[model samples]
Target: SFDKTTFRLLRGESNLFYTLAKWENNKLHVELPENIDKQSPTMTLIYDENGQLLWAQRDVPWLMKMIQPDWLKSNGFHEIEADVNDTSLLLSGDHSIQQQLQEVRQNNNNAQMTHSVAVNVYPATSRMPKLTIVVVDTIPVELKSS
Candidate 1:
């Protein structure tokens, strides 16, 4: 009864046409590029179901079931609840566009004990595998297309 959606990303990549995701009836409908034919040597999302869509094509989910470590079972969360609470959905497509290091050398003539560094942490999530806590900080966000 939880199954939903029409189209899917059979095999390919998609361009990030929009930032906002439309979740209708337990599904996310994002916009696609213009006038794209899947059969003609294409690599993007593909819809699993067949129907009339205004925007464009879509990709079927990669993971069909909820994926978690064996520990999740040891915890709770079995028996699907009726009125499911708002599950924090995080869908990010990012990659390192550019990297730069600020000037840290204040003294080039005289050698001094000095150093500099920057640190950041990014969290990620996914719905395909029905997974959680993904480490994609290196890639930063998921980049669907160039």
Candidate 2:
């Protein structure tokens, strides 16, 4: 839905090489001769389960592209999930009511008591880890949760 083109250069790549670049399907495809080397691209090798190689080599800057926003977002989400997992681990195998709810999965084991080791941990870790999003217009916004 746009009608303009823009050209920009990376750190040290010359403009002459940039002229050879092409755009297709909203992607910038860079093509250069073997002598003109760019060190960003990395190789991924695929092999069968029996250690038999099935594909030839390919060079695309998969490693260099990992610094994009989606990658950072994914890594951030993983850390958040890991912290939740740690909370689960801390309450595991304890005879406390909150501990059983946080650590154990639902089961129909038919008549058994939950065990939570003696601790003051939350007494309620099961209801935590809520995602709260705050939108603001300025930098000095105060968060007053009710």
Candidate 3:
């Protein structure tokens, strides 16, 4: 259960969007713009299973409202907080979201499914440089049984 995925960065309420990452061959490749300053906006991605990716951000109420699907609004999203000193972020699926995704797959009769998750980012230099996030696309067998 693999499909192409893309990401965009939503900056505040201005409606400005920036394409920053892509999912390919089970990896999330990211390229941060050089001039990006502190206060990075919300990073979002869409997947085939009606899944939404989330990263560390102080506020995301606008983003939560932007996502239209009721399923996504309820249980089809994953998020992780970042350390204050962290120069990078990871988007590994949370336990709740992971379990929910598996249930969705099972309901659709696609038991053997994998999701491109587990994001990793390298520390940025003085000027933000190109970054690559390694994605892990494995669903633990234990999750399937539970």
Candidate 4:
């Protein structure tokens, strides 16, 4: 038996659109907009039954504002990776990456530096747990000095 469900695209507190999705053969099938213009929001997001984000369209930075950081944290999505072509954003609940990030932060604490991590987990032609970390410092020099 299959049941259809409605998924809404949210921009912070605003609801932008809704689409029907269904579970088929253990995979969730979704219907997305057929046409999108530069002025239109074009990314699609899918979450598991637990409300954890599973996948999302990559290269849609503007559309990402809809997926809040708090929601991501609450759902156990501690790691994010982009496919080689930058076409898809794969989300994972694995805590190891988070632990690694924390370790790096601790190591840099003496320098008073902050860090942001970007992980690439797969190849464009294919895709696992392989991780490539890109770190950027977020702390301002003034703050670091103080």
Candidate 5:
């Protein structure tokens, strides 16, 4: 059932907590480009079964904690598995954290070079939205006052 959906990018000037996402089983799952140098994106939006917005918070630090090197591994983060028997699989995230680029003095100045990128987190699965924010927001608030 998850393979039948598309990943949508909730991006606009207003959507500060923009994320690439998918929705399934009454849950909204969010994901991001695995190679976001050093950025922890926020969980932007969620809707209830009746399409009611239960909570909306921006610029949260939860994404920072949710995203970690090991967590990425478990969540199928920057790597790809094409063959079941193949063992030689390595991705940028799989390699060193810091990539060393050769210092090339622009032949005369500097210039942008042709670069290609690939992602293994396929869209079929990437699009399956999970209600991560909703799950976190499920808590009882204390009604105490003096």
Candidate 6:
């Protein structure tokens, strides 16, 4: 449905290697190489799970690519589908929502939960480690399939 192929470096990733997209596709897949010398491509999507870009082995400069319309539009910014896991950690459109949702999930065993937890930690932990949970297949995690 298009003709020309445009090549432009996205913003916020001068150090890490990432790619910005301006298309209609809502899903993306990426396979990180065993070597951590290269930077990973970052992509902003309309789904929250797409943001779950994984970093393997060495800790290199992770990338974050975004599409700026220069104006307010339907998705001038990324549009992540709200999702909550069965674990005691809530994650959705709001930061507080993720927190509270976890409390609700742990209480009710059959809460009609679609997304499950990939990782979780105790509520009382030293340093108060920030919890990072994967939404599994219920949500699509975008990646670069190389």
Q: Evaluated with TM-score, which candidate comes out highest?
A: 4
Residue-level lDDT tens digits of model 1 in 1-146: 11111012211122222222343565656543444332222222212222112232323132112222331222111121111010101111111222111011222333222111111111223432121111111111111222
Local lDDT at 123 for model 5 = 22
Quote model 2's TM-score.
0.19
Error of 3 at 118 (Å): 24
**Where does model 1 exceed 4 Å of error?**
1-21, 33-42, 46-146
Residue-by-residue lDDT tens digits, candidate 6, 1-146: 11121012222221122222111244333333445322322222222223343332222221112112221122122223322342222222333444455565567675543321122111213322222211121222221112
**Steric collisions counted per model:** 20, 7, 0, 0, 9, 11
Ranking the candidates on TM-score from highest down gives 4, 3, 6, 5, 2, 1
TM-score against native, each model: 0.18, 0.19, 0.23, 0.27, 0.20, 0.20
Ranking of all candidate structures by their lDDT, best first: 3, 4, 6, 5, 2, 1
In the range 25-60, model 5's lDDT, one tens digit per residue, is 756544544454123221233433333443343333
lDDT of 2 by residue, 1-146 (tens): 10111011111122232234444563434455555432311122222222232321232232123223332211111111122233333223224433443333343332222211100111112322211111111000011112
What are the runs in model 4 whose C-alpha is more than 4 Å off?
1-18, 36-39, 50-52, 59-146
lDDT of 2 at 122: 13
**What is residue 71's positional error in candidate 3, in angstroms?**
7.0
Regions of candidate 5 where Cα sits further than 4 Å from its true position:
1-19, 32-43, 49-146
Question: How high is the lDDT of residue 54 in model 3?
Answer: 32
lDDT of 3: 0.32
Worst 10 residues of 5 by lDDT: 136-145
lDDT, candidate 6, residue 38?
A: 29
Tell how far residue 115 is off in model 1, in angstroms.
Answer: 44
Residue range 82-132, candidate 3, lDDT tens digits: 221121112122455455554555575534332222233333344333332
